[PDB]
Each structure stands twice: as structure tokens, then as C-alpha cells.
């Protein structure tokens, strides 16, 4: 933003918005997969209790 | 007088304030093309060398 103009800067930002949002979608997928594995262990721990 | 293209000159502009607006008002120099900065931003930046 301290270097480009709104009609051509936005293409540089749009790549970054994509790549950062993609990295959150990776994290939330990886957390949903680990969280299913912790649950599988919590329901086992509840069965041993 | 200017340099021949193989003998091309190069000068350090340093330790000074650089204004595009006063040049453009002076300019019969009727072209421009930038590659990593917007023309609209050139008066608001600052530069290393």
C-alpha cells in the first residue's frame, strides 16, 4: 500500500488474501483431524473410567 | 550534453529532497513508466539510495 495504486495493488493483495486464507483452511482441517483422534482417545479414556 | 548509450552516465542522488511535481511542471519531458512503485506514490515515499 505504501508502494502501489488501488487499481493494480489489489492484485498483489488478492494473492496474499488467497494464500493466507488457504493456510487457515489447512490449519482448521489439520485441527479437525487431530481433534477427531483426541476424541477417539477421550471415548476410550471414558470407557476405561 | 548527454552520454552516448554505451558510455552511459550514472550519478548518485543523495542526502537531499526529491520532488516529482516541480519537475513535471518544468517538463516538456512528456513520458513516464514505473515498474515497482506507482507514479501517484513517488512524492510520498522515501528511498535508501
Curated annotation (Swiss-Prot), chain A:
Function: Subunit of the fusion protein that is processed upon entry into the host cell. Mediates fusion of the virion and cellular membranes by functioning as a class I viral fusion protein. Contains a viral fusion peptide that is unmasked after S2 cleavage. This cleavage can occur at the cell membrane by host TMPRSS2 or during endocytosis by host CSTL. In either case, this triggers an extensive and irreversible conformational change that leads to fusion of the viral envelope with the cellular cytoplasmic membrane, releasing viral genomic RNA into the host cell cytoplasm.
Protein name, per record: Spike protein S2'
Organism: Severe acute respiratory syndrome coronavirus 2 (2019-nCoV)
Amino acid at each position: 500500500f505504501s508502494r502501489l495504486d488501488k487499481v493494480e495493488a489489489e492484485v498483489q493483495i488478492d494473492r496474499l488474501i488467497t494464500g493466507r486464507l488457504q493456510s487457515l483452511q489447512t490449519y482448521v482441517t489439520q485441527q479437525l483431524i487431530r481433534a477427531a483422534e483426541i476424541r477417539a482417545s477421550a471415548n476410550l479414556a471414558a470407557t476405561k473410567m | 550534453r548527454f552520454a552516448s548509450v554505451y558510455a552511459w552516465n550514472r550519478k548518485r542522488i543523495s542526502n537531499c529532497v526529491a520532488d516529482y511535481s516541480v519537475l513535471y511542471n518544468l517538463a516538456p519531458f512528456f513520458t513516464f513508466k514505473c515498474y515497482g512503485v506507482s507514479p501517484t506514490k513517488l512524492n510520498d515515499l522515501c528511498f535508501t539510495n
